Amino acid sequence: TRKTYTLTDYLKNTYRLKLYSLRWISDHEYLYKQENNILVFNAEYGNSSVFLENSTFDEFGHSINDYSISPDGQFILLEYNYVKQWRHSYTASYDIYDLNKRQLITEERIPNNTQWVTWSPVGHKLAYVWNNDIYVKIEPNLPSYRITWTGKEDIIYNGITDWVYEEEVFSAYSALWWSPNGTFLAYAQFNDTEVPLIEYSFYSDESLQYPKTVRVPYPKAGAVNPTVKFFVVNTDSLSSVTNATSIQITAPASMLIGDHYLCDVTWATQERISLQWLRRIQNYSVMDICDYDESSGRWNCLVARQHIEMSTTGWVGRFRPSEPHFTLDGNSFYKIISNEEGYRHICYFQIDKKDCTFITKGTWEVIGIEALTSDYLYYISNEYKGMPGGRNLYKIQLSDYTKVTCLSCELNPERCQYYSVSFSKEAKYYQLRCSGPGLPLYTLHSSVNDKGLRVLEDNSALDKMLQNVQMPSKKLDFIILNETKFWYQMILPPHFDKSKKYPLLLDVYAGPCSQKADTVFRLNWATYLASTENIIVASFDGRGSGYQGDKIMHAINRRLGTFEVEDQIEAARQFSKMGFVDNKRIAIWGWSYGGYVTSMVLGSGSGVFKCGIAVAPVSRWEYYDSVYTERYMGLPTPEDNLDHYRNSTVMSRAENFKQVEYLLIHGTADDNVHFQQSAQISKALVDVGVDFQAMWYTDEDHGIASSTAHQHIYTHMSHFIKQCFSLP
């Protein structure tokens, strides 16, 4: 009898997925770390040399967290003293190593506690943010030029995002954008002066006598938002003038009438930048296209070049308006937008014409535009086999839109249905990354003939390991509700028997534009539950889920906590009808949005679920941030949508938790979904006399991802599920 995949296997990572993370440094060369040596690979032939020997920084005196080679290959940026902040933000120390001289640079050093640093895209200029101000070094050993003087901790942010712009808009800490050859540096400035603070305790090591109060500018739904300004400085003039002018590009009049956001910055050419702005009511966006005027040194945005993107059924974009991809000359661009049918497709614009031309169409969606050459556009879509949860690379001929080639579809169709891609600098080569339904497979290809060059990593080591393990299987399929297909997946125990009744766990996220049913291979908690505990772990994509058109995605518009919640309940009813599910043993669990949905389902009075686990749930939309919440809910005012805000809380359903077993879990240092949200759930439950299980995680944030806490939470949850299902 082969062993099963156990909780320890999962928690100790005994069965390891191999990756192949390369970094393109030119059109035909990439860097790859092998045995802590940095190797440089010729893409065409596969041969390598040592770029930087593992022993180079033995006497550095610090553990190096990451590195970054300048585009011209002359310098390497060494990152150490890494200190995490939020999802993307952190601070660090930096040294620069001169690759030609083979010397560490010791003068005019990047200061300690630096917030962000980046090379120019050409050469070896550096821009960094320190104490909320921007600085530029033209040469690594020379003095910095200060760009901004207004930086103020928790108040003014120059070239870095505040909490909400980092999480909800840019998915980055950085708010700086070099122009393509590095002449200009564009940046955003955020003003949080009147933004209210979330305040919570951080306990730290036990040696800390008094807990620390962490205070973060965080706008909750309907609260005062940060304001934003945009500037461009000419870095080439820095060594010529005492104090180079940052030229402001003001938002259009249509944004200035009320609260708004900067949502996209994309350079088109050396002297043309595009900016997208979004109204606080997130169904109206404007793209300005701005040209440098040589004789005035100003930036002007012609109204003839201004592009409106709006929605009548929901918000604009999946999570924000999509980025443009400009042709080399900067006179036209490609952009994913929702078509007349509500499906997201590639539209082609001339910069000074308002109507675009759709170059793709159909009842499927383009996920992203990956590369653009003079002859071809490359994109990922879920077109293949009508499967919204698959992903493949396509190539469309720019001079003939009827010529569309799927580059990945038929490579290994049994093993590989979910792809991402990595193109070299001028798209001469691409790495394909297959992530499922079989073991991940990494391969290299030449764009000139789309021929496979070689297999990079095929995970044969893991395959060999998994032969001696009773592994679960995955079913991906659909049910039909109101003449619409809704997709689900099931992690099924080994030797699955259709004539037996299995306990079922519903794994839920269900946020807007989410997808929990897909072709990705995962080794996770569900793997253990199916493999060792013989539990079916199911997930379902109902109304509000993504990549299936706006009719489904915008169904929850202004109504979170309704259809996406009901559809999970209905999914569980449908899984019962299938005949291999023990109706007396159906559980539900989720993290984040999934914790909200789980709690809403457990408080619905449906009778379907015996028990459930919510980890770091939202409990009331007014507690969550403005940008995310208002996108789907509008404003919590009597004029707008307050009634539904107040109607969609977990707390109002407290009495119904008498029918279920509930485990509530939250990290105390969660800056994202505040511990407040679960403090309010537990209080409401105490107030109606409902017994439940609770667990706080001291100083853990939204990820509860520290090594010991991760192991602890999954161990705690396993006991709870096993208890609920009467499993020994």
Ligand X SMILES: *[C@@H]1O[C@H](CO)[C@@H](O[C@@H]2O[C@H](CO)[C@@H](O)[C@H](O)[C@H]2NC(C)=O)[C@H](O)[C@H]1NC(C)=O
Ligand Y SMILES: *[C@@H]1O[C@H](CO)[C@@H](O)[C@H](O)[C@H]1NC(C)=O
Ligand Z SMILES: *[C@@H]1O[C@H](CO)[C@@H](O[C@H]2O[C@H](CO)[C@@H](O)[C@H](O)[C@H]2NC(C)=O)[C@H](O)[C@H]1NC(C)=O
- Catalytic residue numbers read 592, 670, 702
Please compute, for residue 42, the number of CA atoms within 13 A of its CA located in the half-sphere on the CB side.
6
Residue 114 DSSP symbol: B
Query: Measured from the CB of residue 65, what is the shortest distance to its own copies in angstroms?
Result: 23
Q: Is 99 in the site for its own copies (CB under 8 A)?
A: no
Give the chain's count of helices (H) and strands (E). 12, 46
322-327, long-range: CB < 8 A, 24+ apart: 322/264, 323/264, 323/266, 324/264, 324/266, 324/268, 324/274, 324/287, 324/349, 325/369, 325/372, 325/377, 326/266, 326/268, 326/269, 326/274, 326/372, 327/372, 327/374
Note whether 553 binds ligand 448 by CB under 6 A: no
Single-letter residue type at 190: F
Decide: residue 1, CB within 10 A, 0-12 exposed, 13-18 middle, 19+ buried: exposed
Q: Which does 310 bind (CB under 5 to 8 A by kind): ligand X, ligand Z, ligand 448, none?
A: ligand X
Rule CB under 6 A: choose which of 53, 66, 72, 194 binds ligand Z: 194
- Exactly one of 144, 191, 360, 431 binds ligand X (CB under 6 A); that residue is 191
Q: Is 220 in the site for its own copies (CB under 8 A)?
A: yes
Query: Is 555 buried (19+), middle (13-18) or exposed (0-12) by CB count in 10 A?
Result: buried
Measure CA 203 to chain center: 29
Give the three-class secondary structure for 263. strand
CA–CA distance, 565 with 508 (Å, rounded to integer): 10
Say whether residue 186 binds ligand X (CB under 6 A): no
Radius of gyration of the chain (CA): 26
The residue among 77 and 456 lying less far from Na ion, judged by its C-beta, is 456
Contacting residue, 22, 43, 156, 597, with ligand X by CB under 6 A: 156
Phi, psi of 388 (to 5 degrees): -60, -25
Instruction: Residue 155: name the closest of 174, 131, 175 by CA.
Output: 131
Could you tell me which residues come within 8 angstroms of residue 81 by beta carbon, excluding any fewer than 6 positions away?
62, 91, 92, 93, 112
168 binds ligand 448 (CB under 6 A): yes
HEC assignment per residue over 508-549: ECCCCCCCCCCCCCCCCHHHHHHHCCCCEEEEECCCCCCCCC
Segment (H or E) for 276: strand 272-279
Among ligand X, ligand Z, its own copies, none, the one that 111 touches (CB under a kind-dependent 5 to 8 A) is: ligand X
60 scored as a contact of ligand Z (CB under 6 A): no
Closer residue to ligand Z in complex, CB, 156/216: 156
Residues 203-242 that bind ligand X (CB under 6 A): 234, 236
Nearer to its own copies, 306 or 680 (CB): 680
Task: Give CA–CA dist 631/556, Å, rounded.
Answer: 11
Q: Which listed residue (324, 472, 544, 634) binds ligand X by CB under 6 A? A: 634
448: number of Cβ within 10 Å: 8
Q: Which one of its own copies, ligand Z, ligand 448, none interacts with residue 444, CB within 5 to 8 A by kind?
A: none
Q: How many C-beta atoms lie closer than 10 Å to residue 59's C-beta?
A: 7
Binding mask 27-56 for ligand Y (x = CB under 6 A): --------xxx----------------x--
> Are 713 and 695 spatial neighbours (Cβ–Cβ below 8 Å)?
yes
Given candidates 56, 274, 338, 672, which one binds ligand 448 under the rule CB under 6 A? 672
- Choose the binding region for ligand Z from 41-49, 104-112, 363-371, 703-711 (rule: CB under 6 A): 41-49
Residue in 649, 660, 724, 725 binding its own copies, rule: CB under 8 A: 649
300 or 313: CB nearest ligand Y: 313
Candidate list 198, 247, 569, 627; residue touching its own copies; CB under 8 A = 198
Given 696, 703, 722, 727, the residue binding its own copies (CB under 8 A): 696
100 touching ligand Z, by CB under 6 A: no
The DSSP code sequence of 620-645 is -GGGSBHHHHHHHH--SSTTTTHHHH
Q: Which is nearer to its own copies, 141 or 693 (CB)?
A: 693
Kindly state whether residue 699 participates in binding its own copies, applying the rule CB under 8 A. yes
Q: Which of residues 142, 310, 328, 694 is near ligand Y by CB under 6 A? A: 310
Which residues ranging from 573 to 612 are in contact with ligand 448 (CB under 6 A)?
A: 592-593
Q: Which does 622 bind (CB under 5 to 8 A by kind): ligand Y, ligand X, Na ion, none?
A: none
Establish if 319 lies at the interface with ligand 448 (CB under 6 A).
yes
Interface with ligand Z (CB under 6 A), residue total 11
Euclidean distance between CA atoms 343 and 476, whole angstroms? 22
Which residues are at the interface with ligand Z (CB under 6 A)?
40, 42, 45, 47-49, 150, 156, 191, 193-194
Which residues are at the interface with ligand 448 (CB under 6 A)?
167-168, 171, 318-319, 511, 513, 592-593, 618, 628, 672-673, 702
Which residues are at the interface with ligand X (CB under 6 A)?
40, 42, 45, 47-49, 93, 109, 111-112, 149-150, 156, 181, 183, 191, 193-194, 234, 236, 243, 270-271, 281, 283-284, 292, 294, 310, 312, 634, 640
